[PDB]
Curated annotation (Swiss-Prot), chains A, B, C, D:
It catalyses: beta-alanyl-L-lysine + H2O = beta-alanine + L-lysine; beta-alanyl-L-ornithine + H2O = beta-alanine + L-ornithine; N(2)-(4-aminobutanoyl)-L-lysine + H2O = 4-aminobutanoate + L-lysine; N(2)-(4-aminobutanoyl)-L-ornithine + H2O = 4-aminobutanoate + L-ornithine. The gene is PM20D2. It comes from Homo sapiens. It is an enzyme of class 3 (hydrolase). PANTHER family: PEPTIDASE M20 (PTHR30575), XAA-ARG DIPEPTIDASE (PTHR30575:SF0). Gene3D superfamilies: 3.30.70.360, Zn peptidases. The lineage of its organism: Eukaryota, Metazoa, Chordata, Craniata, Vertebrata. This is Xaa-Arg dipeptidase. One of its GO terms (biological process) is proteolysis. Catalyzes the peptide bond hydrolysis in dipeptides having basic amino acids lysine, ornithine or arginine at C-terminus. Postulated to function in a metabolite repair mechanism by eliminating alternate dipeptide by-products formed during carnosine synthesis. The keyword Hydrolase applies. Its EC number is 3.4.13.4.
């Protein structure tokens, strides 16, 4: 309330600090949206974002590390520059995504994800910078995570230990409605290659193998759990009709709400692929993807605290697929709310690219960044909340084996 | 020629003896045709045929053994009753078939097969009975072989040793044209049963197994040798749609021109059946038929001698499927000529039953019986022919491993 | 409260009247459970239930009509016998089901459905019988509806106009948990018959038609809405392998949450069935079931009033498939709550038959009957509720076209 | 015999003229074999062959027309230069093929086909050049026909009228054995394209269409005539698994021994392709090849005359697929004998390329060219043969509708 240094007053400061930075935050979104770049090729977005945190006044007050582990990834850190000597500081992480989609551009609104992560972290710092009483030990960490749509850049960062010292991690994703949580499933990719032998009696038909595998999985759909998903293509199904195909290649991905269910679904698919080899006489290589994507672990305490802030900002509550943030949420407590940006268009369509770059989307983006920053302030000043986040994180970890 | 006791004169005697017996031979065909009986159920035909050889004058001059090994099989033997004491007699076999088809009756003309086997043997005896100079040691053996269309009664007789002491075996089969030999293939029967487990996620779908097996074999047809044949049905594909089928059953038969090719074809089918089990998660029982049918081994010497007789009778030369005579032809040299009976109807159709019982078919049946009997006389009096039959039989046996 | 003739006091009377009748209501359930009868064959259950309402004291105070429209259906009615002359009486319906399942008996607990419908109606009458002040014009109607698991006896009753004068209809169904509503989908049954022509070149393969139809639907599953369901069997897939099958027969049922979605799903299946005919060369008969089952329309006012009563009885809130009550709920406002009976066994399994007939299930059955009866009392004495039920019923009817 | 100007003496002259030209004919084969060129790209072979006939002494005695209708086709003509004025001259055609195979080179021995056509025509001219008595009116015509393995260059030449004035046409093809005729079937090519629409419920799956078409044809194989052939590939079966494929493409070719059978086979395939569209909901384009290849019409008189010559040369008598010579044989009487070249390797394999260019193949090639040339001499001097060829050609034309 009207009290010296209230949490409600710090929350107001962070919202004022975000409104003051609206112009240059909009420029940041425009720079990434206008130059769409694909996974691991986000060189321009990496330059724009590293320069953004280097130029925040005072110069070099954000400690920026470009090319952090990945060439297009980065890391920016800020803390109050004073020590006292008590005693573990709180580490709060904010993620920026910035990879686009082939052909249609930023049809997932990833330019706004970079903006919202930068804005939230800016707002937190400004609320803590305007504090007389020595501020609690906090480090604001920003991580640029490339290649969300393909590869999974967060996973490469996890393998470098980038998340081992974070206590909470925040990010947000533009969608069609406002929701503090939405079920993103685990995912496993696979590439299947069949090899036979090229009169047609003396023939092993690798095209038959591909078709029989397709038939095997198709009838299996009747026994799939209703939450499971299986999609795939025949990449190579022959070259010339006068030669019996001695090579075929399929590309599939499977999805399930948990890792244990995903392993069961993957094993039944493996049987379907191996059966086609047995029936055709071909040999088969089944090569899984480099990284499995994890389902997103929810955190009741963090989500309930986030919704209470958004309701004050005026957000009314009620996705794209699977994200490498699920791997993050398995090692650091986090939230990944989806927000609406003034459009009815669907994600990963051409009309969403229009909305993602529109002037009208800027209001909704900064508003949700305000909600993230206030939620970070809650964790900083409510120790009962921090233990609540850690309790919910520990319990959900056991239920996922 | 016009020489005392010429082979040409004995051949004429056998034709006269067959013409004299035309009336009662026609009655024999009529008795079997008018009362069609199925495999192993030919009780009436067994009575008619045993009574036929018992009534041939003088009474009991044919040594008849009813219920020989099988209830509806029989054996009849005749030899010149005088001994001399020299020295191995020649054993000449003639087979009678007499089983019909379900519903359509004697649509394969099996009544005429019984007639032609009885007639040939009658003609041989009459040619040798009217001989003054002590006749060469010969035993005429007639074997009633039931269950040709299903089961294979000749094979049951082979297992009892019925063919171990025969030197040559004769029979003939009514068809659409006249041919001393026609390619009957080997055959292997199989019954495939799938077992699963009965919400549908917790389900093993045995109907999927049947359909996937069908798909597996269907695409395999492109790589089958053009002489191979595969036919099958889904006998049991479920009972009620609201229960996931936990049981399915297929019935298939495979055909190939040789036993070595048939084993290769059977092994690829086995892979197709097992792949469906792997893809569906079901277990599978693959039960082969009680008896595999063999392809018919030709005998150049016997066939060339048969065609030379038929040409004298006026027969001009150029099938149903697979016959257990192929198993016989692997242990005794034999011939299985097909003959035309005055009709364009196809075997195993309703209109062939009409032809098989017609008066017009009697002329062609007795004519081909005349050709068989003269061919038997050739073997009896041409030792160079007998060794030629045995040489060709020995060589063909090696080529079939 | 402690007021002369309170609704809370009438609700207590109905619970006392149900407890007093527990012994003979248990006997009623035992009589149906011990003699399981199938659809349209429930002659013994029809006798037991008609005799039950005829014996309720005073004799013939329930007006019983046996063999109502169907041979095993019945109708029982009671009202206060006094007229006043004001003015439309309220008609309250209670349904009794009593058909079992082949082999496993009453694995859906339908004996308890008959009991709960009889008990609810008994409790309502006893609450209104013990009233001095002239009671509001009410008619309690009980309808025996045979053949729920097959055929749909309620639909036959709808076609006779049995529901045209009911204002509200009640029934309850034993399951695994307590829920005032659970989503039962619409359903459409179909029987598909393929006709071809019986050498195999001159052949139309009706078995191919069945298998191709199966393949057509199987790959379609990937594009089915996740709430849709398709299940089917190959009833007839051939008779003998040596005859090319000229006839095949499939039996399928489809489910969708609305009639509009069900028509779309049925049309795509029709394309899959017709494509198999085109590909094989066969003709096809597609024969839909005699009666389509409708999805169950919820009624917010009735369900919220029912849950408020159950909470007082001690019921804690949170199915089998599709029911012909959905057709009823489209013409009369109704509720179809599911209740737990002391077991973890699943419906339509052998172990549920054990629970359905157990002594332990009697407490839960009478308890839910108490909840239904009190809910009926709410409708009788709260005119604001009756209009609320009619408003919600009218609006839901428009959303379903 | 030893008679002035005997046909046997002219036949000897043609064999001597071919032996004298062995060195430069071998060089011709070597020039084409060492520089393999594909269909319609045979620029170097066109230069070599046109220069060959231009250099035959006396210069320009062969009237050479380069770039005849096609850029790599050619035409060379020779006749005795003297007129007499009687009266229609005999036109005798010899074809040269010279296109190779992708990757493996001249694995069909087409370099030897060019050689044998040049050699036969050289031998005919030399036999007629060494004649005093005015020679009968004959024109020797050589036609370079490119693109046999793809496209069908003879068909392009037929459409230009190149064959309308030929009386007999000769060519020969290296294989594994010596045969005056071998059954080459008719062929029809087709390209099938499926178009759908890209959540997956709102999806038309063009990949399903391709797979269902494959299933439709696969089960049809059981009812195909045993002489029919169907082969095909899935050229395009998707691009990325996360997008439902809205486009697929198949490439198939069908073969049958006659055009009437080929139309029936093509119509059943058309049904299979259209059924997949109906089942999937996609639209379909079925585009047949630019040119259908015809089966080769035999000519008993020409073949019997050819075998009588080859037997004198020492050839003992007893393929690759389908050839555009079948279209030629439908408008001009011709023969297309296959000859052995000293190898057991199969056509269109890497080891056949070795044999085709070997020194050992030259003897067999020149020998068969001798047989062709003597057969041409038979037609020139036996008018009874010419009418016999024309009678057999006319009758076979009616049997093919
Ligand atoms: Zn995305
Ligand atoms: Zn995204
Ligand atoms: Zn038969
Ligand atoms: Zn037969
Ligand atoms: Zn039920
Ligand atoms: Zn039920
Ligand atoms: Zn070739
Ligand atoms: Zn070629």
């Amino acid at each position: 309330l009207y009290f010296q240094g209230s949490l409600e007053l710090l929350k107001l400061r962070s919202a004022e600090c975000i409104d003051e930075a609206a112009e240059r935050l909009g420029a940041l979104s425009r720079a990434i949206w206008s130059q769409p770049e694909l996974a691991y090729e986000e060189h321009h977005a990496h330059r724009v974002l590293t320069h953004f945190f280097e130029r925040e006044p005072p110069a070099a007050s954000w400690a920026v590390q470009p090319h952090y582990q990945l060439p297009t990834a980065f890391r920016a850190e800020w803390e109050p520059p004073e020590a006292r000597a008590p005693p573990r500081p709180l580490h709060l992480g904010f993620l920026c995504e910035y990879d686009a989609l082939p052909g249609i551009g930023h049809a997932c609104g990833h330019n706004l994800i970079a903006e919202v992560g930068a804005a939230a972290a800016l707002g937190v710092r400004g609320a803590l910078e305007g504090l007389p009483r020595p501020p609690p030990p906090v480090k604001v960490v920003v991580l640029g995570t490339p290649a969300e749509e393909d590869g999974g850049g967060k996973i490469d960062l996890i393998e470098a230990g980038a998340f081992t010292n974070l206590d909470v991690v925040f990010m947000a994703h533009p969608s069609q409605e406002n929701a503090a949580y939405l079920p993103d499933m685990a995912e496993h990719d696979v590439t299947v290659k069949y090899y036979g032998k090229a009169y047609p009696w003396e023939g092993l038909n690798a095209l038959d193998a591909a078709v029989l595998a397709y038939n095997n999985l198709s009838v299996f759909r009747q026994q799939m759990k209703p939450t499971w998903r299986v999609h795939g293509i025949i990449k190579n199904g022959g070259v010339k009709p006068n030669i019996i195909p001695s090579y075929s290649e399929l590309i599939y991905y499977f999805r399930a709400p948990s890792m244990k269910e995903l392993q069961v679904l993957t094993k039944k698919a493996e049987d379907c692929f191996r059966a086609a080899a047995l029936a055709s006489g071909c040999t088969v290589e089944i090569k899984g993807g480099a990284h499995d994507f994890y389902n997103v672990l929810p955190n009741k305490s963090l989500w309930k605290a986030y919704m209470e802030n958004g309701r004050k900002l005026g957000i009314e509550f009620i996705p794209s697929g699977s994200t490498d943030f699920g791997n993050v949420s398995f090692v650091v407590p986090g939230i990944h709310p989806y927000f609406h940006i003034g459009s009815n268009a669907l994600n990963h369509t051409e009309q969403y690219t229009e909305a993602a770059g529109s002037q009208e989307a800027q209001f909704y983006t900064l508003r949700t960044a305000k909600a993230l920053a206030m939620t970070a302030l809650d964790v900083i000043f409510k120790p009962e909340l921090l233990e609540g986040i850690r309790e919910d994180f520990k319990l959900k970890l056991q239920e996922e084996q």
